[PDB]
Design a binder for this molecule. Sequence first.
Ligand SMILES: CCCCCCC[C@H](CC(=O)O)NCC(=O)O
Ligand SMILES: [Fe+2]
Length: 285
Amino acid sequence: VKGEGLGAQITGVDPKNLDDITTDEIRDIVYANKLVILKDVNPSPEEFLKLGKIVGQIVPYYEPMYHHEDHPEIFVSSTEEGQGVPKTGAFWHIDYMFMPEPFAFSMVLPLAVPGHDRGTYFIDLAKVWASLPAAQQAPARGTLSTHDPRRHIKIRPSDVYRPIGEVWDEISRATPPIKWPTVIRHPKTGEEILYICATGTTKIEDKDGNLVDPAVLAELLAATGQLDPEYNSPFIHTQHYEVGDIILWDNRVLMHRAKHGTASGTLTTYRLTMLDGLETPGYPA
Ligand SMILES: CCCCCCC[C@H](CC(=O)O)NCC(=O)O
Ligand SMILES: [Fe+2]
């Protein structure tokens, strides 16, 4: 492990001797540093899958148009016609944050990268929460937030010529809004996390079930730095893609968003998403 914290680089990951990596060792590195780069791995699809199985329980994405043609577990973001889906993740989110079991870990392998300006922005939601005074934290504790993904589900090739209301209705059954505690506690690190997302968090309600003042959700979102279109907030870390360098991170603690670029060429990334078996997203706080 070269550095410490978000950009930490890890050098010994050999795609033909993955049996040397144990689950507890890679998990502890990820929990501690939150975002790590497995440098110069360049795995095949099957070696990637082996590494994913080391990390945790691989969950395939629910929508098969994202699947790798040969490996349903691999979520494919690619500008190649008919390969996965182009330009995914162009908005702040947590992977599967709208689903019954959000992922513990996300893992992205960049396969083709044009230029050197694309990657992912990350925000540490535990550091945001720890930054807030107790009086500001108090309206958020013991509440439930609603996360509505539906407006961000993408039109699929098989949706062409469907009435949009029927596509919407199908989305509403597949990915209905869901409620999570506004503040959660990481089941492993003990860290409290402000689990809110400008893209999908619509409201906060208290233990009675009453609406909390809309000014509370708005203030907290602003505090995360998710509402600055110029990405200058101190809480934003920028991680640039590099071919073969695998990006692996804690999907409970980090909110992220695609960073786009200007260079011509194919952008192709493969993603594996894993549960760790612990309370997800976390314990209520
Ligand atoms: C709660 C915020 C809604 C996020 C919409 C989810 C669509 C994305 C895929 C894509 O960006 O096309 N989901 C990926 C995942 O959750 O792992
Ligand atoms: Fe994502």
